[PDB]
Design an enzyme around this catalytic site. Structure first.
Site, mmCIF file in Angstrom:
data_model
loop_
_atom_site.group_PDB
_atom_site.id
_atom_site.type_symbol
_atom_site.label_atom_id
_atom_site.label_comp_id
_atom_site.label_asym_id
_atom_site.label_seq_id
_atom_site.Cartn_x
_atom_site.Cartn_y
_atom_site.Cartn_z
ATOM 1 N N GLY A 22 31.515 -16.771 -33.900
ATOM 2 C CA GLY A 22 32.073 -18.035 -33.476
ATOM 3 C C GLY A 22 33.005 -18.630 -34.518
ATOM 4 O O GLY A 22 33.403 -17.986 -35.490
ATOM 5 N N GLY B 142 28.510 -14.914 -31.902
ATOM 6 C CA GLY B 142 28.639 -15.387 -30.533
ATOM 7 C C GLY B 142 28.722 -14.261 -29.524
ATOM 8 O O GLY B 142 28.215 -14.377 -28.406
ATOM 9 N N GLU C 30 24.566 -13.211 -40.311
ATOM 10 C CA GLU C 30 24.282 -14.631 -40.476
ATOM 11 C C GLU C 30 23.669 -14.938 -41.836
ATOM 12 O O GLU C 30 24.028 -15.940 -42.462
ATOM 13 C CB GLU C 30 23.348 -15.120 -39.367
ATOM 14 C CG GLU C 30 24.060 -15.498 -38.078
ATOM 15 C CD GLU C 30 24.644 -14.303 -37.358
ATOM 16 O OE1 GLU C 30 24.144 -13.180 -37.569
ATOM 17 O OE2 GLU C 30 25.603 -14.487 -36.580
ATOM 18 N N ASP D 120 21.281 -16.888 -34.627
ATOM 19 C CA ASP D 120 21.287 -18.169 -33.930
ATOM 20 C C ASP D 120 21.180 -18.035 -32.417
ATOM 21 O O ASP D 120 20.329 -18.680 -31.801
ATOM 22 C CB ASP D 120 22.558 -18.949 -34.287
ATOM 23 C CG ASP D 120 23.822 -18.147 -34.050
ATOM 24 O OD1 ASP D 120 23.713 -16.932 -33.785
ATOM 25 O OD2 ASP D 120 24.923 -18.731 -34.125
#
Ligand SMILES: [K+]
Ligand SMILES: [K+]
Ligand SMILES: [K+]
Ligand SMILES: [Mg+2]
Ligand SMILES: [Mg+2]
Ligand SMILES: [Mg+2]
Ligand SMILES: [Mg+2]
Ligand SMILES: [Mg+2]
Ligand SMILES: [Mg+2]
Ligand SMILES: [Mg+2]
Ligand SMILES: [Mg+2]
Ligand SMILES: [Mg+2]
Ligand SMILES: [Mg+2]
Ligand SMILES: [Mg+2]
Lengths: 128, 190, 232, 160, 50, 467, 110, 75, 53
Positions: free
Chosen positions: F81, F132, F155, F163
């Site tokens: 993202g 994402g 991440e 996430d």
RNA sequence: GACUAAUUACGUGCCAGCAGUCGCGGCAAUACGUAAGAGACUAGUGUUAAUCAUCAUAAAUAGGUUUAAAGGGUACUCAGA
RNA sequence: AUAGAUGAGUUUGGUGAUGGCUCUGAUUGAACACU
């Protein structure tokens, strides 16, 4: 035709068809009176055979036509005032008219029982 | 039950698979009847070519055609072929066709139109028989070029089999084709 | 089809005349069309006239005929409804076969269907003779008690007839305010006023007043109606 | 002019009759207006301005067309994706109504009558599946999109 | 057109419609062909598109 | 959620590009194509607001029978993202921090909608899939990988945690592969994404165009259950398979796979690293010295706080529901926006592009955190200032209802052994036949038996090694 | 009884026998065919684009379809042992049961 | 002609379900499959009393029923 | 009233279900109808003169 | 007779006659004449004459011209489209 | 005004077309015959 050709008047009335009884159709008349110039016989064409009783009538309009005499036996002759209507004799060439049986001088079939209104025959009145 | 006194429905009883009593309940009609002739070395040979239709009156119609030297035999051949060639015909509310259809068979064009309920079968004589046999009740027809008895029945029968299917037109365009009359009354009002 | 028995006709007469319930309520209660409820009252009022004027009723004919016909008994035994009080007239526009293309996920409702037939067409929700039944059925969906749902139905029908009775009152008044009644020695002259300018843009208006010019007598045409068409 | 729309209608008939998966059209704002309405109605699959050769089939939407200037405006063409469902073209017939020899215009009340399948003027009522495209001051619309917006205008063609 | 009308791509659509209802109106339809449910979820592939 | 309620919740905010996503519609196919190739199709609020309304709308249709999501270019499907933008907002006081929390609010509403979507959902992983891009795929019944596919969850490298629904997918993967992929942020490529289980099918990038034109032809019946529809699409994807590589072997299998189950089975990152040192030590019977040494060099670079938080959710997420997962992660993500590691890791790695040296986490290493310390509970405690995440629907489940379209894993092989009494070779043919010749079954089932199966009954039959 | 017709026809050379394939189109019988570059693909329901002039390619295609049928027959007979029939009585035999009980019903009273 | 509208249906549904699927509502399995399944599918939502034909043909001589002399004979 | 109602409809927003269901057409093709002069028209004309000579 | 709802018997014998179209009548005529019956309209019923429609049968809406009525011997051209 | 759009006989050894003719529908400021 294109829109331009139509705008200039390409569409015209179709050529007229000849009527069955032109002497009556020309003037919108249902019948006409006339004097018998000759009362004789006409011969049908190839398929049919016999002697068709016809009359040469001089209509009140001046035209001379040939009318068919319906029924068995007639009373008219030379110099006889008769009424003429439309309708033709299919097998006779030139006979494009009929004579009315209850007409002025032409009499109706006397010994007629069926379809008396077609031959100008009064009812026998035998019952009364 | 001794209904078949000539064993004519024996083979038809195997193809279709319905009793002779059920076969006699179908709505048959001899539509076309031609007197054809063939010139041979032995002289003219005149036959009787006939066309027959068969239907349940509830969405099935079949067209049969046969010829023979005897007018009676040709009507039986065409009847057997008409009962075995039956096909399901789609109907809108079991009363009319879907939309408009125009079929051409060799210079004979037929145009069938769907009409609202209560319109009736305002069609010619031979189309009235096919619609009254397939179960249709509201239709309008029109011959545009030729009124050949044979080709008018072939074009009419072919038109009833080539109706626009709204289920396919929707999947093709990716859009619903909502039946307005069904949403308005909350269901199909036959 | 069955007929309202003699006892049922009387029950309908009491609920509309004595109890004063609105006709729409008696219709929805016994499942009798408002057009029939209004007829049973007119026919009953004519009996009270005969019974009051000491006219003999055709009682022998009545009893013998009622036995020949099927009957419904309004009251205790609610076997079946007398008739469907929600029959809507099939409008010509709603008879057409329309397949409107819309998005794959549209919510096409009856309101959208009415507009697909015409700009002035209404959904069947507004073509009912007792349209309060819909609002009554929506109360049940909201878990509203039956006793309360019935209360709102009476007040709804009782209030709708008030507007109808009020419109008719004002209507008949305007019909009288336009009439000037001058009493002479012999007759009573009634001068009805109208707007002589409402003849249409070309003078051909259906509701115009006056013997129209430029038209011969149609007395020689076929299918010409020469008998009264309305006994008011 | 209207002649280009008439050529666009007969060409798409011939491309669908030949069962072609792609087809090219001259690049004009008028052809683009009708193509966007056909795509908006669901009759074609894609619209893309490109050169004399069709773009990459797989990467058709993500295709990057170069800017159109006077140096290449003569070679630009509109590439249309055609649909075929159930062994039948989705864009079978494209019959024009207004032609170079005559521009047929309809009123709002005539379109309201043609939308429900009743003749009006030189038009005929629409049946199941048929569509009608009108060139109005609000753009090329479908007859049911025009009556909703309450406008008339020039009738282009009837799409079966 | 000398060629014949081949409807091989529509055997399922044609067979499934003929099996939907019964020719003797008022009775349940008979059992369909044994192949109808086999290719129920295997439609033909698009052909003739260039 | 109504149609207008969605159009009002996903209004186009200022700055949104009009064509970040391309939507196509065919006969039975509805397509979503991420169209930011220059940025590797990285998700952002602009394009998330275009996808959610469509998915909600196509769900109201009966003519949209298959949903396919894919990327634009040939290099990426969806590469994370717009975390780089979040690091800037966080540096604008609390007013900027909430903007980031609202982003994860949208991103999770979409992942939950995809996970609980009521129509067949397919994802073309024809490129790098990270961040994402993982959320749009893992929750789908069909996940197609190609030779271009590159899966990873980097991440922990930026001071963050897995996430997008990762707290529900990874914990319930076969063995301890979940924690390994999440903690180490390993990188799988090509068919390795298909053997691991992240992908359910393996095709070639050139076969995807033909697959779409076929998925559009599949017209189901309205009365078919979701199971029948998924079976028709599963059989259709397996027709366009050109076979797996003939020489490429299962990466996480055998020795490495066994080591992961021994080293990543604890509940403390300190014990995990302690176990890895044993494998890297000389003479370790595992035989994965080279592998253990490499993983150690990675963990030392990851954020020490992220390792504790990550390892904690992998143990808790195993008992969470899918709906309850996205709500907790929305609270966890909110705590990371306020944390120091996230803003430092992102600013140091992405905004600076590696310049200014490596990152500088709050603790210089894991040795700074004493044993009794607990730096995880703070993140797993809801914040009353952060409203609960309101999902687009009320659907949920404890385990994926349809997640058995990939290769057979330990769970499948175990059930077949504990149920039947097959043999070594007979058991392999039980799956090769049950899956109707799915490419990779023989290699996968063979590997599972090499680890979790021994001849407890001799050559007669085979049972598990546990007991 | 009416003779049987095949429920599926696998033709290894459609180009040479269109009479067989046209009767399957009329009888509503699905068909599979090997469509070579000169063969009309509209003659069969399921096309297999491949060289039909090679006995090596025809043996492979035919052998693969033979294994498919064998694998399908195995499942049908395995489900039967469990008491699960994967098909229903055809319409031909179905009608026989009805009229068969009728003859038994007739003698039921008599 | 006339059609019967049940207030219970019009109060619970707005007619949208009648346009599901591709415009004509969802499809139901053929008749040779329903009885095969011991469980009957849920009743399809629709106004009660639908899918029954209307005898329009039987109203050919309705105009005669309006004459006074005929109404007396029908009473 | 007839005028306001008709003018309102002609300038009404499209239906939401029509927006979230219709496929995408790149604005590069649906709105770029204007054809400007080639910015390099002068450089090309000077190079064409050298080549033609 | 068929189109067109409605039959036999006798007489006549390509004769007498019927006939809107196709046709009928040459010695065992449901087509002519008579008898009876049957099918219809009814204070009207038939026939003649005329008009519209049938007739996309002068086609603006809306036709056509290789072999059936119908492509100019030619194309440069003012007007016009 | 949203119900309003229909055919039939007849060319050929036969078939399909082309193309007229006639009948089927409504009517008259009508006439004539039988009433
Ligand atoms: K003709
Ligand atoms: K990609
Ligand atoms: K002749
Ligand atoms: Mg003659
Ligand atoms: Mg008599
Ligand atoms: Mg060959
Ligand atoms: Mg007769
Ligand atoms: Mg006579
Ligand atoms: Mg006689
Ligand atoms: Mg009178
Ligand atoms: Mg010439
Ligand atoms: Mg000359
Ligand atoms: Mg010349
Ligand atoms: Mg000859």
């Amino acid at each position: 035709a294109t829109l331009n050709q139509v705008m200039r008047g390409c569409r015209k009335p179709q050529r007229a068809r000849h009527a069955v009884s032109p002497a009556l159709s020309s003037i919108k008349s249902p019948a006409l009176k006339g004097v018998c110039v000759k009362v004789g016989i006409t011969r049908p064409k190839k398929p049919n055979s016999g002697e068709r009783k016809t009359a040469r009538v001089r209509l009140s309009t001046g035209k001379v036509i040939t009318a068919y005499i319906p029924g068995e036996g007639h009373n008219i002759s030379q110099h006889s005032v008769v009424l003429v209507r439309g309708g033709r004799a299919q097998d006779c060439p030139g006979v494009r008219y009929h004579l009315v049986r209850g007409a002025l001088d032409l009499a109706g079939v006397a010994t007629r029982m069926s379809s008396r209104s077609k031959y100008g025959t009064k009812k026998p009145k035998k019952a009364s | 039950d001794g209904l078949d006194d000539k064993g004519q429905y024996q083979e038809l009883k195997k193809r279709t698979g319905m009793s002779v009593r059920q076969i006699l309940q179908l709505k048959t009609k001899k539509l076309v009847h031609r007197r054809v002739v063939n010139q041979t070395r032995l002289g003219k040979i005149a036959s009787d070519s006939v066309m027959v239709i068969a239907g349940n009156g509830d969405g099935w119609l079949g067209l049969g055609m046969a010829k023979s030297v005897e007018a009676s035999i040709a009507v039986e051949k065409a009847t057997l072929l008409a009962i075995q060639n039956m096909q399901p015909i789609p109907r809108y509310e079991n009363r009319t066709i879907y939309g408009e259809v125009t079929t051409k068979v060799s210079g004979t064009i037929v145009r069938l139109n769907s009409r609202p309920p209560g319109f009736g079968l305002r069609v010619s004589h031979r189309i009235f028989e096919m619609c009254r046999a397939a179960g249709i009740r509201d239709l309008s027809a029109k011959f545009l070029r030729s009124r050949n008895p044979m080709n008018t029945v072939k074009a009419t029968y072919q038109a009833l089999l080539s109706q626009p299917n709204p289920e396919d037109l929707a999947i093709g365009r990716g859009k619903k084709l909502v039946d307005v009359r069904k949403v308005y009354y909350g269901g199909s009002v036959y | 089809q069955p007929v309202l028995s003699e006892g049922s006709r009387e029950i309908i007469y009491q609920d509309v005349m004595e109890k004063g319930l609105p006709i729409k309520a008696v219709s929805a209660k016994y499942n009798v069309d408002v057009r029939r409820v209004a007829a049973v009252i007119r026919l009953k009022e004519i009996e009270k006239r005969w019974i009051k004027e000491y006219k003999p009723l055709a009682r022998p004919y009545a009893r013998a005929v009622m036995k020949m016909l099927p009957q419904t008994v309004l009251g205790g035994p609610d076997q079946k409804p007398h008739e469907s009080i929600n029959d809507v007239h099939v409008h010509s526009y709603t008879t057409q076969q329309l397949f409107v293309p819309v998005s794959e996920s549209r919510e096409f409702t009856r309101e959208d269907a009415a507009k697909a037939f015409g700009d002035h067409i209404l959904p069947v929700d507004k073509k009912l003779r007792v349209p309060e039944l819909i609002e009554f059925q929506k109360d049940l969906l909201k878990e509203v008690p039956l006793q309360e749902a019935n209360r709102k139905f009476l007040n709804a029908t009782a209030a709708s007839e008030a507007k109808i009775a009020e419109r008719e009152a004002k209507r008949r008044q305007a019909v009288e305010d336009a009439i000037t009644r001058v009493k002479t020695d012999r007759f009573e002259f009634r001068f009805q006023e109208f707007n002589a300018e409402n003849v249409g843009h070309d003078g051909r208006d259906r509701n115009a007043v006056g013997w129209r010019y430029g038209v011969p007598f149609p007395d020689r045409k076929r299918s010409q109606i020469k008998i009264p068409t309305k006994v008011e | 002019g209207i002649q280009q729309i008439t050529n666009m209608c007969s060409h798409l008939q011939n491309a669908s009759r030949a069962r072609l998966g792609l087809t090219s059209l001259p690049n004009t704002k008028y052809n683009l207006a009708l193509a966007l309405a056909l795509h908006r109605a669901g009759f074609i699959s894609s619209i893309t301005r490109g050169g004399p050769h069709p773009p990459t089939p797989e990467a058709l939407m993500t295709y990057e067309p170069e800017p159109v200037t006077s140096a290449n405006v003569a070679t630009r063409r509109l590439w249309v994706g055609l649909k075929y469902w159930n062994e039948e073209p989705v864009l079978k017939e494209l019959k024009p109504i207004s032609k170079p020899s005559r521009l047929v215009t309809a009123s709002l009340e005539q379109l309201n009558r043609v939308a429900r399948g009743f003749p009006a003027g030189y038009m005929k009522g629409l049946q199941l599946g048929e569509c009608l495209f009108v060139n109005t001051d609000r753009g090329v619309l479908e007859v049911r999109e025009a009556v909703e917006r309450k406008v008339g205008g020039l009738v282009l063609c009837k799409v079966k | 057109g000398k060629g014949r009308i081949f409807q091989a791509a529509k055997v399922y659509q044609r067979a499934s419609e003929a099996a939907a209802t019964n020719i003797v109106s008022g009775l349940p339809p008979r059992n369909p062909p044994l192949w109808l449910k086999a290719i129920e979820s295997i439609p033909p592939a698009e052909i003739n598109t260039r | 959620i109504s149609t207008q309620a969605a159009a009002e919740l996903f209004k186009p905010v200022e700055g949104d590009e009009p064509e970040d996503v391309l939507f196509n519609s065919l006969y039975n196919l509805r397509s979503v194509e991420l169209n930011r190739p220059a940025k590797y199709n990285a998700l952002n609020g602009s394009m998330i607001r275009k996808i959610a309304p469509r998915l909600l709308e196509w769900e109201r249709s009966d003519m949209a029978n298959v949903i396919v999501i894919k990327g634009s270019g040939e290099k990426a499907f969806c590469a994370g993202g717009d975390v780089a933008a979040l690091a800037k907002q966080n540096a604008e006081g609390p007013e900027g921090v909430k903007k980031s929390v609202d982003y994860f609010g949208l991103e999770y509403k979409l992942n939950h909608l995809i996970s609980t979507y009521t129509r067949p959902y397919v994802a073309f992983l024809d490129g790098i899939t990270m961040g994402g891009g993982v959320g749009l795929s893992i929750h789908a019944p069909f996940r197609i990988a190609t030779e271009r596919t590159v899966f990873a969850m980097p991440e922990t490298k930026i001071g963050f945690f897995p996430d997008v629904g990762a707290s529900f997918f990874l914990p319930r993967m076969p063995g301890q592969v979940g924690p390994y992929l999440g903690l180490t942020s390993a990188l799988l490529k090509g068919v390795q994404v298909y053997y691991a289980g992240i992908a359910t099918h393996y095709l070639h990038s050139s076969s995807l165009p033909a697959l779409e034109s076929r998925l559009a032809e599949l017209t189901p019946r309205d009365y078919w259950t979701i199971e029948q529809r998924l079976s028709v699409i599963n059989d259709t994807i397996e027709e366009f398979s050109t076979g797996v590589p003939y020489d490429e072997n299962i990466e996480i299998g055998g020795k490495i796979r066994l080591a992961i189950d021994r080293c990543f089975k604890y509940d403390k990152i300190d014990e995990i690293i302690a176990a890895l040192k044993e494998e890297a030590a000389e003479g370790a019977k595992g035989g994965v010295q080279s592998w253990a040494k490499n993983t150690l060099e990675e963990l030392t670079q990851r954020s020490p706080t992220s390792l504790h938080v990550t390892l904690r959710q992998m143990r808790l997420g195993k008992s969470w529901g899918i709906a309850h997962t996205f709500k907790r992660e929305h609270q966890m993500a909110a705590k990371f926006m306020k944390s120091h590691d996230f803003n430092e890791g992102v600013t140091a790695l992405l905004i600076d592009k590696g310049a200014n040296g490596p990152a500088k986490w709050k603790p210089a290493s894991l040795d700074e955190i004493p044993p009794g310390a607990n730096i995880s509970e703070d993140y797993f405690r809801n914040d009353p200032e952060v409203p609960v995440l309101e999902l687009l629907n009320d659907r949920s489940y404890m385990q994926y209802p349809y997640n058995k379209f990939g290769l057979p894993n330990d769970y499948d092989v175990k059930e077949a052994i504990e149920k039947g009494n097959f043999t070594r070779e007979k058991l392999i043919d039980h799956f090769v036949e049950t899956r109707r010749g799915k490419q990779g079954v023989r290699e996968a089932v063979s590997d599972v038996l090499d680890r979790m199966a021994v001849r407890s009954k001799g050559t007669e039959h085979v049972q598990w090694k546990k007991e | 009884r009416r003779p049987l017709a095949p429920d599926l026809v696998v033709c290894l050379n459609p180009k040479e026998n269109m009479t067989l394939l046209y009767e399957c189109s009329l009888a509503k019988i699905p068909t599979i065919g090997i469509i070579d570059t000169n063969t009309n693909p509209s003659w069969v329901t399921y096309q297999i684009p491949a060289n039909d002039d090679s006995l090596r390619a025809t043996a492979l295609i035919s052998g693969v379809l033979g294994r498919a049928g064998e694998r399908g027959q195995k499942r049908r007979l395995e489900a039967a042992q469990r008491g699960v029939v994967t098909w229903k009585t055809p319409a031909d035999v179905q009608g026989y049961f009805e009229l068969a009980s009728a003859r038994a019903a007739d003698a039921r009273r008599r | 002609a006339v059609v019967n509208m049940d207030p219970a249906y019009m109060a619970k549904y707005n007619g949208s379900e009648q346009a599901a699927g591709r415009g004509s509502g969802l499809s139901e399995p053929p008749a040779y499959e329903k009885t095969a399944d011991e469980k009957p599918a849920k009743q399809v939502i629709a106004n009660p009393g639908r899918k029954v034909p209307t005898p329009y043909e039987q109203m050919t001589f309705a105009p005669l029923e309006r004459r006074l002399d005929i109404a007396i004979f029908r009473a | 009233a007839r005028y306001l109602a008709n003018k309102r409809a002609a300038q009404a927003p499209e239906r939401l279900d029509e927006v979230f269901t219709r496929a995408t057409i790149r604005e590069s093709t649906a709105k770029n109808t204007f054809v400007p002069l080639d910015p390099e028209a002068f450089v090309k004309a000077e190079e064409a003169r050298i080549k033609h000579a």
